[PDB]
Amino acid sequence: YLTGKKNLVVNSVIRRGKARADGGVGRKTTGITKRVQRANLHKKAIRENGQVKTVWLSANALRTLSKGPYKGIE
RNA sequence: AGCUGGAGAUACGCUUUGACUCGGGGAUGUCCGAAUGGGGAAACCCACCUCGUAAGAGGUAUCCGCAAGGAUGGGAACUCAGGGAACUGAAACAUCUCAGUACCUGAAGGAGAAGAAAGAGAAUUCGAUUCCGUUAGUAGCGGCGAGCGAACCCGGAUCAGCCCAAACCGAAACGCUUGCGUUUCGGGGUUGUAGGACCAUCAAGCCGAAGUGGCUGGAAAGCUACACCUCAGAAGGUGAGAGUCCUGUAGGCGAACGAGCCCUGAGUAGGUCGUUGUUCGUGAAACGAUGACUGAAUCCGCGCGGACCACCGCGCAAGGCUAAAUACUCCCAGUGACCGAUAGCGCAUAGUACCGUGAGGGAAAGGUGAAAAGAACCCCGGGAGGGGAGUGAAAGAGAACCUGAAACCGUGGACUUACAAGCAGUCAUGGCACCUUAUGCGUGUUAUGGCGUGCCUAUUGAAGCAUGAGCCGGCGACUUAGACCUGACGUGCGAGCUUAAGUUGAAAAACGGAGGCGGAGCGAAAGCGAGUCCGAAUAGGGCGGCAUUAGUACGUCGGGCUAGACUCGAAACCAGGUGAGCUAAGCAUGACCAGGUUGAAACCCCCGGGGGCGGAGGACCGAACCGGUGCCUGCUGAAACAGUCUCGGAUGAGUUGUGUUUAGGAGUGAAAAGCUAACCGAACCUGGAGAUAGCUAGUUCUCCCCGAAAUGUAUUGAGGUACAGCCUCGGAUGUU
RNA sequence: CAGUCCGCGGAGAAGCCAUACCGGAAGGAGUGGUGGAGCCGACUGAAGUGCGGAUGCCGGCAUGAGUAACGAUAAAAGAAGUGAGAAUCUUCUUCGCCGUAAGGACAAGGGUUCCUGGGGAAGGGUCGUCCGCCCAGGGAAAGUCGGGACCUAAGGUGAGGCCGAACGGCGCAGCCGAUGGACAGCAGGUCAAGAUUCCUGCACCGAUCAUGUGGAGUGAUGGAGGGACGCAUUACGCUAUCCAA
RNA sequence: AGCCGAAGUUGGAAACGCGACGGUGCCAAGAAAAGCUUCUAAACGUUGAAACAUGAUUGCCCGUACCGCAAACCGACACAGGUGUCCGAGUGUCAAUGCACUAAGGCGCGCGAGAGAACCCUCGUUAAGGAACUUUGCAAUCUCACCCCGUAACUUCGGAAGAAGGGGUCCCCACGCUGCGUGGGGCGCAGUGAAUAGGCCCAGGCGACUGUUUACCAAAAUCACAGCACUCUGCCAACACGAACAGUGGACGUAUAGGGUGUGACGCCUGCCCGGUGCCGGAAGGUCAAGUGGAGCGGUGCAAGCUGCGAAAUGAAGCCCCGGUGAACGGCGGCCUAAGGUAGCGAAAUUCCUUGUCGGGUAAGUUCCGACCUGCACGAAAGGCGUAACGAUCUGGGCGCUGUCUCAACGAGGGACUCGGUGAAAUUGAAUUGGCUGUAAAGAUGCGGCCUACCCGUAGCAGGACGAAAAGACCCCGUGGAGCUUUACUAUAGUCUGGCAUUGGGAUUCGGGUUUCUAGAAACUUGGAUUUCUAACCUGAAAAAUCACUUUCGGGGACCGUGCUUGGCGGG
RNA sequence: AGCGCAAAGGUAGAAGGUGGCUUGACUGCGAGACUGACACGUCGAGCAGGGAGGAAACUCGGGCUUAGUGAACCGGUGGUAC
Ligand SMILES: [Mg+2]
Ligand SMILES: [Mg+2]
Ligand SMILES: [Mg+2]
Ligand SMILES: [Mg+2]
Ligand SMILES: [Mg+2]
Ligand SMILES: [Mg+2]
Ligand SMILES: [Mg+2]
Ligand SMILES: [Mg+2]
Ligand SMILES: [Mg+2]
Ligand SMILES: [Mg+2]
Ligand SMILES: [Mg+2]
Ligand SMILES: [Mg+2]
Ligand SMILES: [Mg+2]
Ligand SMILES: [Mg+2]
Ligand SMILES: [Mg+2]
Ligand SMILES: [Mg+2]
Ligand SMILES: [Mg+2]
Ligand SMILES: [Mg+2]
Ligand SMILES: [Mg+2]
Ligand SMILES: [Mg+2]
Ligand SMILES: [Mg+2]
Ligand SMILES: [Mg+2]
Ligand SMILES: [Mg+2]
Ligand SMILES: [Mg+2]
Ligand SMILES: [Mg+2]
Ligand SMILES: [Mg+2]
Ligand SMILES: [Mg+2]
Ligand SMILES: [Mg+2]
Ligand SMILES: [Mg+2]
Ligand SMILES: [Mg+2]
Ligand SMILES: [Mg+2]
Ligand SMILES: [Mg+2]
Ligand SMILES: [Mg+2]
Ligand SMILES: [Mg+2]
Ligand SMILES: [Mg+2]
Ligand SMILES: [Mg+2]
Ligand SMILES: [Mg+2]
Ligand SMILES: [Mg+2]
Ligand SMILES: [Mg+2]
Ligand SMILES: [Mg+2]
Ligand SMILES: [Mg+2]
Ligand SMILES: [Mg+2]
Ligand SMILES: [Mg+2]
Ligand SMILES: [Mg+2]
Ligand SMILES: [Mg+2]
Ligand SMILES: [Mg+2]
Ligand SMILES: [Mg+2]
Ligand SMILES: [Mg+2]
Ligand SMILES: [Mg+2]
Ligand SMILES: [Mg+2]
Ligand SMILES: [Mg+2]
Ligand SMILES: [Mg+2]
Ligand SMILES: [Mg+2]
Ligand SMILES: [Mg+2]
Ligand SMILES: [Mg+2]
Ligand SMILES: [Mg+2]
Ligand SMILES: [Mg+2]
Ligand SMILES: [Mg+2]
Ligand SMILES: [Mg+2]
Ligand SMILES: [Mg+2]
Ligand SMILES: [Mg+2]
Ligand SMILES: [Mg+2]
Ligand SMILES: [Mg+2]
Ligand SMILES: [Mg+2]
Ligand SMILES: [Mg+2]
Ligand SMILES: [Mg+2]
Ligand SMILES: [Mg+2]
Ligand SMILES: [Mg+2]
Ligand SMILES: [Mg+2]
Ligand SMILES: [Mg+2]
Ligand SMILES: [Mg+2]
Ligand SMILES: [Mg+2]
Ligand SMILES: [Mg+2]
Ligand SMILES: [Mg+2]
Ligand SMILES: [Mg+2]
Ligand SMILES: [Mg+2]
Ligand SMILES: [Mg+2]
Ligand SMILES: [Mg+2]
Ligand SMILES: [Mg+2]
Ligand SMILES: [Mg+2]
Ligand SMILES: [Mg+2]
Ligand SMILES: [Mg+2]
Ligand SMILES: [Mg+2]
Ligand SMILES: [Mg+2]
Ligand SMILES: [Mg+2]
Ligand SMILES: [Mg+2]
Ligand SMILES: [Mg+2]
Ligand SMILES: [Mg+2]
Ligand SMILES: [Mg+2]
Ligand SMILES: [Mg+2]
Ligand SMILES: [Mg+2]
Ligand SMILES: [Mg+2]
Ligand SMILES: [Mg+2]
Ligand SMILES: [Mg+2]
Ligand SMILES: [Mg+2]
Ligand SMILES: [Mg+2]
Ligand SMILES: [Mg+2]
Ligand SMILES: [Mg+2]
Ligand SMILES: [Mg+2]
Ligand SMILES: [Mg+2]
Ligand SMILES: [Mg+2]
Ligand SMILES: [Mg+2]
Ligand SMILES: [Mg+2]
Numbered sequence A: 001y002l003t004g005k006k007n008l009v010v011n012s013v014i015r016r017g018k019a020r021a022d023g024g025v026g027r028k029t030t031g032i033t034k035r036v037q038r039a040n041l042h043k044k045a046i047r048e049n050g051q052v053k054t055v056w057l058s059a060n061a062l063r064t065l066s067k068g069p070y071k072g073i074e
Numbered sequence B: 001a002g003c004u005g006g007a008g009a010u011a012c013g014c015u016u017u018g019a020c021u022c023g024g025g026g027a028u029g030u031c032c033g034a035a036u037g038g039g040g041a042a043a044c045c046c047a048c049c050u051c052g053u054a055a056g057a058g059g060u061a062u063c064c065g066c067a068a069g070g071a072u073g074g075g076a077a078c079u080c081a082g083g084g085a086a087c088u089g090a091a092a093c094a095u096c097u098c099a100g101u102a103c104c105u106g107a108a109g110g111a112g113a114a115g116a117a118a119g120a121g122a123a124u125u126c127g128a129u130u131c132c133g134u135u136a137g138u139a140g141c142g143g144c145g146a147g148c149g150a151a152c153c154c155g156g157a158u159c160a161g162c163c164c165a166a167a168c169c170g171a172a173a174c175g176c177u178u179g180c181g182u183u184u185c186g187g188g189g190u191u192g193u194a195g196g197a198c199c200a201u202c203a204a205g206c207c208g209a210a211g212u213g214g215c216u217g218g219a220a221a222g223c224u225a226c227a228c229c230u231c232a233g234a235a236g237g238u239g240a241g242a243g244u245c246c247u248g249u250a251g252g253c254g255a256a257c258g259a260g261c262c263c264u265g266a267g268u269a270g271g272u273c274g275u276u277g278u279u280c281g282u283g284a285a286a287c288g289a290u291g292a293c294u295g296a297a298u299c300c301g302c303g304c305g306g307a308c309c310a311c312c313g314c315g316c317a318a319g320g321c322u323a324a325a326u327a328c329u330c331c332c333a334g335u336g337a338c339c340g341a342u343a344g345c346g347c348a349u350a351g352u353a354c355c356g357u358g359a360g361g362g363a364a365a366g367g368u369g370a371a372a373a374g375a376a377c378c379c380c381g382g383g384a385g386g387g388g389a390g391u392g393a394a395a396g397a398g399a400a401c402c403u404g405a406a407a408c409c410g411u412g413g414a415c416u417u418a419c420a421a422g423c424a425g426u427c428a429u430g431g432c433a434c435c436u437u438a439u440g441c442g443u444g445u446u447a448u449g450g451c452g453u454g455c456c457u458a459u460u461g462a463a464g465c466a467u468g469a470g471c472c473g474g475c476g477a478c479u480u481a482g483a484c485c486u487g488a489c490g491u492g493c494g495a496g497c498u499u500a501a502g503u504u505g506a507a508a509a510a511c512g513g514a515g516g517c518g519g520a521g522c523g524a525a526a527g528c529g530a531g532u533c534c535g536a537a538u539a540g541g542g543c544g545g546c547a548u549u550a551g552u553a554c555g556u557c558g559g560g561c562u563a564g565a566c567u568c569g570a571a572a573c574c575a576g577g578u579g580a581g582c583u584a585a586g587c588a589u590g591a592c593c594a595g596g597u598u599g600a601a602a603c604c605c606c607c608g609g610g611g612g613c614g615g616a617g618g619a620c621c622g623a624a625c626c627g628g629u630g631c632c633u634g635c636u637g638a639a640a641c642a643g644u645c646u647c648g649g650a651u652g653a654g655u656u657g658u659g660u661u662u663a664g665g666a667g668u669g670a671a672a673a674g675c676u677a678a679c680c681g682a683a684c685c686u687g688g689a690g691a692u693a694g695c696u697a698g699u700u701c702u703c704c705c706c707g708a709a710a711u712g713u714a715u716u717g718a719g720g721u722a723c724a725g726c727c728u729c730g731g732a733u734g735u736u
Numbered sequence C: 001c002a003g004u005c006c007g008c009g010g011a012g013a014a015g016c017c018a019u020a021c022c023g024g025a026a027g028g029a030g031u032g033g034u035g036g037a038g039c040c041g042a043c044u045g046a047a048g049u050g051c052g053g054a055u056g057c058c059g060g061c062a063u064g065a066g067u068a069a070c071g072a073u074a075a076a077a078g079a080a081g082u083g084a085g086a087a088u089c090u091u092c093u094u095c096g097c098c099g100u101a102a103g104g105a106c107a108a109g110g111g112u113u114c115c116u117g118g119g120g121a122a123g124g125g126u127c128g129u130c131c132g133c134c135c136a137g138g139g140a141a142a143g144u145c146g147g148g149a150c151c152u153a154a155g156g157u158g159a160g161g162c163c164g165a166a167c168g169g170c171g172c173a174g175c176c177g178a179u180g181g182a183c184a185g186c187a188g189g190u191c192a193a194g195a196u197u198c199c200u201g202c203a204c205c206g207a208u209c210a211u212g213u214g215g216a217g218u219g220a221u222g223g224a225g226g227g228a229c230g231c232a233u234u235a236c237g238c239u240a241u242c243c244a245a
Numbered sequence D: 001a002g003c004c005g006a007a008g009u010u011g012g013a014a015a016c017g018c019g020a021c022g023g024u025g026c027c028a029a030g031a032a033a034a035g036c037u038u039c040u041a042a043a044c045g046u047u048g049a050a051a052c053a054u055g056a057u058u059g060c061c062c063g064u065a066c067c068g069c070a071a072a073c074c075g076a077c078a079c080a081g082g083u084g085u086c087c088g089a090g091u092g093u094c095a096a097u098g099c100a101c102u103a104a105g106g107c108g109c110g111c112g113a114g115a116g117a118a119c120c121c122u123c124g125u126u127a128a129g130g131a132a133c134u135u136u137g138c139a140a141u142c143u144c145a146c147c148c149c150g151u152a153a154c155u156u157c158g159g160a161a162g163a164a165g166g167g168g169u170c171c172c173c174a175c176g177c178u179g180c181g182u183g184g185g186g187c188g189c190a191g192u193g194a195a196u197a198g199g200c201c202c203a204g205g206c207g208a209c210u211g212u213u214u215a216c217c218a219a220a221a222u223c224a225c226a227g228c229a230c231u232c233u234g235c236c237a238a239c240a241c242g243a244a245c246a247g248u249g250g251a252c253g254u255a256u257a258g259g260g261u262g263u264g265a266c267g268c269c270u271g272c273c274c275g276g277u278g279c280c281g282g283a284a285g286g287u288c289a290a291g292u293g294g295a296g297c298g299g300u301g302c303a304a305g306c307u308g309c310g311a312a313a314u315g316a317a318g319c320c321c322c323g324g325u326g327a328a329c330g331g332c333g334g335c336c337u338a339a340g341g342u343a344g345c346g347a348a349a350u351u352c353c354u355u356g357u358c359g360g361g362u363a364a365g366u367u368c369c370g371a372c373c374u375g376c377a378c379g380a381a382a383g384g385c386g387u388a389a390c391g392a393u394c395u396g397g398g399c400g401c402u403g404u405c406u407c408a409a410c411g412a413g414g415g416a417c418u419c420g421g422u423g424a425a426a427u428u429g430a431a432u433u434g435g436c437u438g439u440a441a442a443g444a445u446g447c448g449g450c451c452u453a454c455c456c457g458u459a460g461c462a463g464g465a466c467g468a469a470a471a472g473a474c475c476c477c478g479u480g481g482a483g484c485u486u487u488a489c490u491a492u493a494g495u496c497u498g499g500c501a502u503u504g505g506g507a508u509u510c511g512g513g514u515u516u517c518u519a520g521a522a523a524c525u526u527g528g529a530u531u532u533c534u535a536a537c538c539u540g541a542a543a544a545a546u547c548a549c550u551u552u553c554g555g556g557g558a559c560c561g562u563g564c565u566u567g568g569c570g571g572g
Numbered sequence E: 001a002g003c004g005c006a007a008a009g010g011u012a013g014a015a016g017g018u019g020g021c022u023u024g025a026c027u028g029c030g031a032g033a034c035u036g037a038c039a040c041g042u043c044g045a046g047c048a049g050g051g052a053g054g055a056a057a058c059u060c061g062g063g064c065u066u067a068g069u070g071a072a073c074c075g076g077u078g079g080u081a082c
C-alpha cells in the first residue's frame, strides 16, 4: 500500500488517445480512439517521530518536511 | 388442578404447605467456531504457570494504549466507500449506451449518508442537510446518431445549530547576549448587515349481560311457539348453520421485578501537464476533483458569478460534532374483489431425500370418523387378502380409510362378424332389440346401396411419401406499469376544467392550487402581435376572420411509446468463484521389473589377429507389469470405449504408491489443439440474466357483417422494414 | 373471485355419472344415480378466465408383448433333512473348475456388512424356508505392532521483515508436514464373533524410589563425529523352505 | 500325528531373506534431521556423585470387528471393467513366477428344463485344385521349444543371423565320463508324441536408430533424439511468472555456460541472387513531440494592469538516406527483375497430358523395378544425393501352406426354436393397412378403373412403409458465434526516447545575468557540457543466513531504479 | 448537311454559319401545372429594383432539348449585427 504517510494517495484515471487534433484550428476535431484506465503512485524516504523509523514519503511531503516537522520530524 | 414435550405406548410418579403453564430475572452451561496457551484434516491432539491434598477451578493470541478499557468475528435487505464488467442498443461497429448497472472488496449502524454557505442564484431574494410533488423531458448533452437529462422558483414531510485553532493574560520546561517564544495546560474567542482581540403507556393475566319447551334428525346451533341481553350480533369450538353452551367480544381492573425521548485554519488557494463529476463526450469549457512539477494574499484582503476584462452583486475556504423527516424487512401483529395441495415459499415443511470431488443443484407432499367407539369373536388361507358378526348415523366410512373424472385393463348381456379392398364417417332403406326428457319427424345395434383424400402448420400448391403429435388428465402464452402520446365511446363541469406531493380523519372521505391543459400566432431569434416571416413593399408561406367546429378532469376501450412487453428456444459474452481425488507435467520420498540369449571395454598370455578372462549395453527373447498392432465379437453391450485371439516394449527417454505444487485466455503438452473429473479451437458453478434472437414453432369460447395483398419506389436491401397501393370502422360530403 | 339482492340445503349442497329435452351458437335446464357439506339464479366490478397441437411441462396409463433377455460354455447328479410351499436352504457321497489363483495377508477406502437368535414385505435378474437384505442382542482389549506425547524432504506456514487500489502477494529463523529417519518380545492357547493386544510360559524398555557397591563429577537450544544413502554385476557361509529314502 | 500324546534320522536343493554398511566395475556422481557417541560454557557440588546390581512401583492417547483383485472399494447394478504392497506348494519340462495336471485352500459365476429346423457367434476335419478369392493372402493354415551341422548381397566390421537350409528328439541294456556321449536292441502312423513355443526370401519408398502421440474411429512417413548451424547473453546476465524498486526461476549456473530458432545419426556435400522485408552497422543531409523561446495578432478596461491566441530559432529516439548480412523472410522465369539452377536426383510421396516410351518380371501388368528424359509444378540445413541396421511403417514380387476361393459338405458347442418362473426396449396421428396401371406437390395401402384376396396365427427373409435414431456436421441464408492469421482498422501489456522529481558540493570550457571598474572583469552563476568527487541512492564481504545494526569496511554512483509527462516500436 | 461530345426528337422564315455591342451565366418573388411513395426533380406567365441589345414591337433571370450529378452531419472563407 503506497500510502505516503500524512497525505497518502494512489490514483487512477481513464485516458484518451485523441486523433488529428485541431479543435478550434479546423474541422479535425479529435476522433478519440483510446479509452483505457491508468494508475500512478510515488517513491520512498525515511523519517523520525517519537522514535525514528522509515516510511514511503511523498516528494511533495519531502518538500513540506524540508520546511519543518509536521506532526512527525524529518 | 392438573401435570409427566411432539409421541399417539406401558410402567414409575409429581402435585391444594401451589404443581404445570405463562411473563421477569438469576445460576449452571461439555467441545468446535472470531477461537485466542501451542498444533490441527472444525468439534479432535500436546503443554506450561499459579490454587496446591486430590478430585476440580483460573490464566497463558494479536492490535491500541501506563492504566483502566476498547478492538478482531457475524448480520436477510438497506447505507457509504476503494475497484469496476459484458452481453445489449446503436438493426454492422470503435466514441456512445447498456452503467457507475451486475459483481468483488472495506467500514457501520438500526439505519446510514449529508449537513449549519470562500453556496444557489439574478430579486441588490435566498440562509443548513436529507425526502416527496413539481418545474420537465424545459434547459441542455449526443458518430448533434441510438439516445442521455438537470437545477433554481414554488408546494409539503422535518426543521436545533452547536464546538475548537488564532491575535491576549498566568506560566513551566527549554531556547538563544541580557523584562523574549517552539508545544502543553486553564482564562478569553468563535464571524461577511465581518466577527475577535487591547486601549475608552405496553408486558403475564383477572372480571365480563343475556333462552327454554315442542319438531326433523344419528346429532341441534336448523325449523317452530313464546322470550331475554346488548358500551357485547368481531371471531372461532361444540355431532349441522348458536347474539343468549364454551372461548370470547364491548367495558373495566391489573403486579414485587419488566421494557419505553496586531489576529481569523497554506506546501494550499492558484497555475502547467494527465484526467474526471454534475446535462458537460474539449467543445468558446468556467467550477469542483485529484497523480506529477510548482507555488500567493491578508481586510484599502481573498473565492465565485461558465473562456477573458472592467463594473456590479453573492460569499470567507484550506479544523470538528450534530437528532428528526429518508432506505430496508431476517423478525412480530393486522389485513386481503391473494393462493388453497401441478396453486401458493423449493418445503402444508425439507434446503431433507436424491445428484455432484466441489462450488452447488434439489423433489413429491395432505384428508377414517362426530368421537377410536379404530373391528371382540367365528370362517378360508403360513401369510397377505377376504367373508360373516359386531361398533357406528354411514363399514355404499376399516385404516392402500372424502370425493374417486379420463386414458388403460377386465367380467356379463343385446345386436352382430370368418368371397372381405376398407381416413373409419354421411344419408338412405331394411333386420333385431328396447321404452324412466321415451311408442316417436323414437333410443341401441345392424345388413346392404350411394356418397366421401385424418388434423394442425408451413404453402404458389397438402390425403400426402412435407412438420409436430403414443393416449387422458391436469399446468401452459397478447400482460403490467406511467401525473406518458394519440383516437373512439361515456360522465361531471363547462370558457373554463382539475389537482400532485401531503394534512386531518378513516366500518366512511374531505381539505390540500404548488402545478398542468384550453385562451395567438408568425419568426432562425431579437421581437412584433391578429397579424407575422421572407423583402428595398406589396408576389408569396404559415395564421386569425369566416365554419368563433369548445375545452378539461376522470372511466372503459383501440393503437403508440419505454421496460422481459404474446410464450418457449440459442451457439456466445462478461464477473466472482469451484475444481490437478480423472487427465497433462513438476517436486520430495518409497517401492517393482520370473527366467533364458548375446558376450563391449578393460586385464592376462601367444603371433591389429587367436585364446582366456571379464560382464557392458536407451542389446536380444519372453512372464508379470506397462501399451494397444489387425481381424472378429460386441452395437437398447457383460462394459458410456470392452472381450477372445494376435501384436509393441520388456535395465530404460522405464512402471508404480504416497504426499505435494501448477488452472481458465489460464495451466500442462517427446505437439493431436491433446489433457485439465465420461462433449474443451477455450472446463465447471453461481450470477449479469427473462442476454439478443430481422430466425422457428406455438397462441385456446361462439355467432353476425365486410374483406384483401404477394405491386411500385427506397434501403449493408432481397425470407426483413419505411411510404404509397389495396381492406375495414366512424364522421362529412353528396352523385362526384 | 367481489359487492348487493333472491334464496336453497343432513327429507341432503357442490363435485361425479347417464339422459331421446331446450336456445341460433358458445351454452343451459328436467329427471335419475353416487355423494355427504356447502351452493345455485339476477345486477354490477375485477381477472392468473375458455387448449389438440409448441420433438411443449407434471402426471398416470397404453403399443412393441408375454417379445429380447436373466450379466462369461468352470458342466452337474443322487440320497437325506427342513418346511405352509423346495430344481435352488441345510448336510452326506460322487462330479467338474482356479491353484504367481479364481489361495492368504495387508493399505486404502467402505462402515456393523462380523457373530448368535429370529424374519420373509421389498432388495436377490427365476425360487427362496437362504443372504452381504429386515429385527433385536453381543463381539472390537496393546508400556513393546502403526501413528501421537520425537525428527526432518517437497510442500504449506510464518512474530519480525519486503511489497501491493482493497481482499492480499512474498518472506529469514522457527513451526507443521510420511511416502522417509528413530525405537523395547517371542513362542503357544482359545469366545459363536477379538488377538505380537486377552490368558499361559518366560523376556525387554524407560521412568521413580529404596537397599548397597561406588563413595565423587555431572557434563548444555553451542562445537565435533556419526546418522549419511547411486546403479549393474558378483565370490563365500547360512536360514526360511522344498525333494528322496 | 493320533487313540491324553509317539518319533523326531541321512543325503541333497535353495532364495530377492540373513551374514554385511562384502568385492568389483561404471558415471548420470547418488536427502535432511533428531535420537545416538564425544567436548567443554554457564551453573550445581565436590563426607548422601557418574555408573552398576537387586527389589518394588509406573506404564497415557488414537487405530485393531468385517470386506479388502472384490457381491462389502472406484464403475448409477450382487457390473466379464479397474485397484498399490507382501507371501504364493508339488510333478514334469534346459531354466522360470512359463505351459499341462494337481496339494492346501477356494469355487460351479442366483432362471431352469427339453429339443436337436433356417439363420448367427466360437470351433474341429475336409476329395481333387491351391490364392483361381479379393482393394490387399484380410483372415485361417503352414512355421514352433532345445541340440548338432550349415548360412548370402551388403557392412559403419558391431551386424545382417534364429539368414536361408539339413539333421536329431521316445523306451530298454552294456560301457565311458561328474545327466551326458558311445554302441546295440525295442515300439508306434507318429517320439519338445498332450500344453505353451518364429513362416521365410527378393526388391523398393519414408524415417537413421531405442523411444513419443490424437483417454474413446488416425501410432505413421507425425513428434522428440544425439550431431550440426545461426543468433543472443559480462551477471541484480539475456530470458520468463508477477497488483510489485516485492519475491523467484534461470542459477547457489557465469561464455567449454545459459536462452531462442531451424535442420535432424553417419557420408560427400550445401551453388546463384542485398533488388524488396527483417536485422546489424553508419548517422553528411531530409523530416519529427513535449519542452526552452515568446517576436507579433487580439480582446477588456480612463489607465496600472489582467487576459485569448500565437510564430522564427532551438528541441531525442525513431523513419527517409548509405553499406552490409541467406544454416535471416525469401526469389532462382515469360514462345527484363537482383538474379536466373553448382552438384546431385527426376514420369518422384513432386508427372497434368498419363496406362509416356523401351526393357524386366506374369499367359495376360493402369501397379511395381531399371533406364530415358518433354522436370505442368525437383534441388541443396522449410537441406540435395547416398547409406549398413532398425520398422505392429507403406509398395511390388517369389517360395511354403492353407476352405480366401472353384464349392461347399459333415461335425461340435453358445444362441435361435418348445414348457414352466421373472420380463424390458427404441417406436407409436389414428388405422377395417393388397396387385397393376393411371393421377395427383411430379415415387399412392388410403384418389380412378381393372384384377386378386375366407377369419386368425406361427417360424422365417429384409423389397415397400420415401422404415428407425440425431429439428443435415455438405450447400445457401442470418447486417448469428467462436478459433486462427496478417503490411485490414483501433487501441494496448511490453518496450525504446526527450524533459521534470528523487538529486547532491566541485573543479573544468562557459552563447548569457546583476551591482560591479581603467570596448572591460574579481564578487558570481540561470543553466548546458564533458570530467571528477561521497554524505542521497544501489550493492557486497564480516560471530549476527531474509531484515536491522555497526562496520579497519569494499565497489558503483548523482547514472541505475521509481513517479509524471513526450514521441516511436508494439498481432504479444 | 450542320447542330461541342451518344442517339432519338427537332430544325430551311433556323436551333446551322458570320460580325457589332454588352452581360439577363441578375437580386427579391412565384399564379399555375407536369413528375415522384417520399425526398428530390421539370416547365413556368407575370410584379419590384435595376440593368443589356434594338429605331422600335420586343427579347434576355445561361446553351436546340434530353447526361455533365450526391440529402444529411462536421468544418474553411466573406458579409450581417439576431
Ligand atoms: Mg473510479
Ligand atoms: Mg396424546
Ligand atoms: Mg485452538
Ligand atoms: Mg488458530
Ligand atoms: Mg447491435
Ligand atoms: Mg459489442
Ligand atoms: Mg452492487
Ligand atoms: Mg458489501
Ligand atoms: Mg463490519
Ligand atoms: Mg317464533
Ligand atoms: Mg360460530
Ligand atoms: Mg487539467
Ligand atoms: Mg464527439
Ligand atoms: Mg407446491
Ligand atoms: Mg394432484
Ligand atoms: Mg427447495
Ligand atoms: Mg442421506
Ligand atoms: Mg388389507
Ligand atoms: Mg367398503
Ligand atoms: Mg367410498
Ligand atoms: Mg385400513
Ligand atoms: Mg367429511
Ligand atoms: Mg377414497
Ligand atoms: Mg359372407
Ligand atoms: Mg383386409
Ligand atoms: Mg380434404
Ligand atoms: Mg415449395
Ligand atoms: Mg405427415
Ligand atoms: Mg415422427
Ligand atoms: Mg416522478
Ligand atoms: Mg370527449
Ligand atoms: Mg388560409
Ligand atoms: Mg382518456
Ligand atoms: Mg383494435
Ligand atoms: Mg399506433
Ligand atoms: Mg430467451
Ligand atoms: Mg532393451
Ligand atoms: Mg537382431
Ligand atoms: Mg498412450
Ligand atoms: Mg517382434
Ligand atoms: Mg466462463
Ligand atoms: Mg494467450
Ligand atoms: Mg474429458
Ligand atoms: Mg442485460
Ligand atoms: Mg422483401
Ligand atoms: Mg403504410
Ligand atoms: Mg370524381
Ligand atoms: Mg338429494
Ligand atoms: Mg348438460
Ligand atoms: Mg358431516
Ligand atoms: Mg366456492
Ligand atoms: Mg393464461
Ligand atoms: Mg392450433
Ligand atoms: Mg398435449
Ligand atoms: Mg410422459
Ligand atoms: Mg421369437
Ligand atoms: Mg430367448
Ligand atoms: Mg448377453
Ligand atoms: Mg443338489
Ligand atoms: Mg436313498
Ligand atoms: Mg415334515
Ligand atoms: Mg410363497
Ligand atoms: Mg445322513
Ligand atoms: Mg485373493
Ligand atoms: Mg480404515
Ligand atoms: Mg454372516
Ligand atoms: Mg445368523
Ligand atoms: Mg421373500
Ligand atoms: Mg423374487
Ligand atoms: Mg447358496
Ligand atoms: Mg489401545
Ligand atoms: Mg503384554
Ligand atoms: Mg512409532
Ligand atoms: Mg506464504
Ligand atoms: Mg514431514
Ligand atoms: Mg512408514
Ligand atoms: Mg520396535
Ligand atoms: Mg470355548
Ligand atoms: Mg480371526
Ligand atoms: Mg535390481
Ligand atoms: Mg518307495
Ligand atoms: Mg517382491
Ligand atoms: Mg529441531
Ligand atoms: Mg483380522
Ligand atoms: Mg474399523
Ligand atoms: Mg457404468
Ligand atoms: Mg465384478
Ligand atoms: Mg516361490
Ligand atoms: Mg510353481
Ligand atoms: Mg517344475
Ligand atoms: Mg500358469
Ligand atoms: Mg473370497
Ligand atoms: Mg453354484
Ligand atoms: Mg472359430
Ligand atoms: Mg481341401
Ligand atoms: Mg504347392
Ligand atoms: Mg477376381
Ligand atoms: Mg498381398
Ligand atoms: Mg490398405
Ligand atoms: Mg494373416
Ligand atoms: Mg565385400
Ligand atoms: Mg561377419
Ligand atoms: Mg533357424
Ligand SMILES: [Mg+2]
Pocket: none
Ligand atoms: Mg515301425
Ligand SMILES: [Mg+2]
Pocket: none
Ligand atoms: Mg526315429
Ligand SMILES: [Mg+2]
Pocket: D192, D193
Ligand atoms: Mg508332444
Ligand SMILES: [Mg+2]
Pocket: none
Ligand atoms: Mg493344441
Ligand SMILES: [Mg+2]
Pocket: D207
Ligand atoms: Mg522412425
Ligand SMILES: [Mg+2]
Pocket: D210
Ligand atoms: Mg526395440
Ligand SMILES: [Mg+2]
Pocket: D214
Ligand atoms: Mg484414438
Ligand SMILES: [Mg+2]
Pocket: none
Ligand atoms: Mg488405433
Ligand SMILES: [Mg+2]
Pocket: none
Ligand atoms: Mg531486487
Ligand SMILES: [Mg+2]
Pocket: none
Ligand atoms: Mg524438419
Ligand SMILES: [Mg+2]
Pocket: none
Ligand atoms: Mg509408369
